[PDB]
Amino acid sequence: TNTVGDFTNGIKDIFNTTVVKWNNADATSFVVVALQDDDKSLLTNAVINKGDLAGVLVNVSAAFGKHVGTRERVSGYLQPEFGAPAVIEFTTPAAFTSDVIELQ
Amino acid sequence: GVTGHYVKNKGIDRIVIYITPNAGSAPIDLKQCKLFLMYDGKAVSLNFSKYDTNTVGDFTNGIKDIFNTTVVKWNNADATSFVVVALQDDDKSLLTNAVINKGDLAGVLVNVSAAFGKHVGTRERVSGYLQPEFGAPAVIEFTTPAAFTSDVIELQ
Amino acid sequence: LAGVLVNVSAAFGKHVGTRERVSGYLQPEFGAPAVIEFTTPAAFTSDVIELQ
Amino acid sequence: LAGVLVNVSAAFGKHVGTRERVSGYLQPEFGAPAVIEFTTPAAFTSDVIELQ
Amino acid sequence: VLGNHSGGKINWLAVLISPNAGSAPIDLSQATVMITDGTHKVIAKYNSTFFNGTLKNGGSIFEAKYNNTTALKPLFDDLPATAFGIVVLQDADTSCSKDTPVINKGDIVAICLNVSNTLNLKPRTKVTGAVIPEFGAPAVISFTTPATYLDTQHIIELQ
Amino acid sequence: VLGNHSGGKINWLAVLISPNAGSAPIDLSQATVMITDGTHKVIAKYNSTFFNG
Amino acid sequence: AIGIGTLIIFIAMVLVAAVAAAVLINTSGFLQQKAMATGKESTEQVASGLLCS
Amino acid sequence: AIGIGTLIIFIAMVLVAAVAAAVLINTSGFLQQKAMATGKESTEQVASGLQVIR
Amino acid sequence: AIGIGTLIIFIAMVLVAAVAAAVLINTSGFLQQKAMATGKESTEQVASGLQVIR
Amino acid sequence: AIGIGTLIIFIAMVLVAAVAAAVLINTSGFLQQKAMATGKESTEQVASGLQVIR
Ligand SMILES: [Ca+2]
Ligand SMILES: [Ca+2]
Ligand SMILES: [Ca+2]
């Protein structure tokens, strides 16, 4: 119902379904959750400016059609309309052993 | 070093912590440093406070007994502060605006029984740090012995 | 090499204390200005101090 | 990776002895030259030596 | 990092933090903290209600009060599940004010978080996280809770 | 490195090898090995006939 | 007459600097990945192990 | 005019040097935790044990 | 003519590179003293002491 | 036309940047040998010696 999910004041758990509303993460889109934004730019027409921090949610298992396994790499770029793209690159660890993992 | 005073049938009432700067350290502005101490149920921060009428108690020429009340003036050791007694200082830095520099030795007095609200008993540990405004903190750590048996004890 | 003398306590109307910064520029009639910037130390302990 | 063979004893007219240095460059037609530099060891003691 | 304990858990954490040498002033009112126990990942932000300045002059952490208008009440017990509070432990130049906590060279301040229901910190549990400022490099929280908690030692030093 | 022995000599060597941390994949079919005993200097290259997976 | 040309070559200066900047920015990106990877991998190698009891 | 490009390339040079600095700051963070833990843990291991009285 | 600007910007480039070099030379000076002293002092500390004979 | 000079000064700029690069390539060569030798030699020194049996 709103352009960007307003969690400027904190989240109990970023992955709990009822709190966060993952449902619009279809196999072909992402959604954005606003974590810090003084000037209300994220919250209104979705513009990042200086000092903002925002989180992109992707339903990977639906996007790639399967769950990513251990010892596998994933790489990409988030490419804006103008300007340099943010590189993403990580290799999933050898041993999954906890529910939330810091791929970093 | 650390040393401490035992009141009979009660426990350790007060403690004196001896402190010195490390080789090559730049001068440390003692009056801004804070001392954090942990014990069985409390974690307390204490801030510098002036000795009577003067910044640091001048005992550069010796003390009959560091714990005798009338000589030493313990009274400003409130439940939230410490006071500093200057034991060796050639250049008069401690004595004037409270700055430790090379070769100085000074003693911090803490009224532990007032700070933690009770006397510390036998077989108990206390640990902390005296953290300066910049630079590395002095670690404090000791376990009170099993049997108190004399008035002044060398917790060290 | 030349040395500029300034009576700071008269210029600013008080003596500058510890932990305070002072910054400025000496600006010539033409050409680039000399930047000045320093923070007075935490503990004054000698008469002549090398603010540098 | 390729290996250049040189008949040193014929090139310099004598065998190179112990404790002696030899230095040079292989200079291509364009681009940076490969530097060569080594000092023969103090004690020859095996037939093939790793001057490296 | 320090941590009160009752029951089978660590229930409050107090994360003491200070500027890096030569840093420009950091405005904590715009910081964000992120913590995970490997089963959940909370993110929390400053609620101005929970400030205690007085402790710059000494006192007990973990028993600090705060001021809802007309009363004084205990800080840690009241702090909401998605928020962090702040307690000034050293500040020479009164730079921290309740509406604008800006820390400058020399200051030390404790970020107070109540984790009792949000993260399940039983023994032998890894905790990972960061305090992320508006600009500049994050502080990294990283500790594993002890193997044994003892009833004689309710305050624990974690990092 | 491991080495079978008969008679008065070591006759076969088996040199176990693995990548350095963070290395890109190495194609051994284009490697070269060089060994010397101080009297001779052999250089040897991969013959695909001799693989056991 | 002179004015016209000045404008045109100015445009080229801009574009050529832009193209060069792209190289530097991109390349920095390409290296960022491998730089981190190498450090993490190397640490995990030195720190980890098993011990016979 | 030559000035125009000199400005633009400076912008790039700054940005690249920033990115390069970042990786070292980040990596130093990663190593900090790993180092500190390794020391603590190793110490506790040596220091501790049990003894059979009778 | 294009040459005119090329000259002028070179003058600037030199000057900036000079200033940048300077800070490293200066800083190396500052660190020299601090390092040398720290070593000396620390050495004397370990090396020295008194012993009670009787 | 302005274009004429722009071309000519580019030729110069390239050439200067070449010369500047060269000195670093050359110097890296000089340092290579000096470094490698210093390490080898120092190692042999520590590693070697004689022992009087009787
Ligand atoms: Ca914004
Ligand atoms: Ca002194
Ligand atoms: Ca401050």
Numbering used by the authors:
A (entry chain e): 118 to 221
B (entry chain g): 66 to 221
C (entry chain A), D (entry chain Q): 170 to 221
E (entry chain f): 67 to 225
F (entry chain R): 67 to 119
G (entry chain S): 13 to 65
H (entry chain T), I (entry chain h), J (entry chain D): 13 to 66
Give sentences from the paper:
The archaellum consists of an ATP-powered intracellular motor that drives the rotation of an extracellular filament composed of multiple copies of proteins named archaellins. Instead, archaella are structurally homologous to filaments of the type-IV filament (T4F) superfamily. As is typical for other members of the T4F superfamily, ArlB1 and ArlB2 consist of an N-terminal hydrophobic α-helical “tail” and a globular, C-terminal β-strand rich “head” domain. In the assembled archaellum, the tails constitute the core of the filament, whereas the head domains are exposed to the periphery.
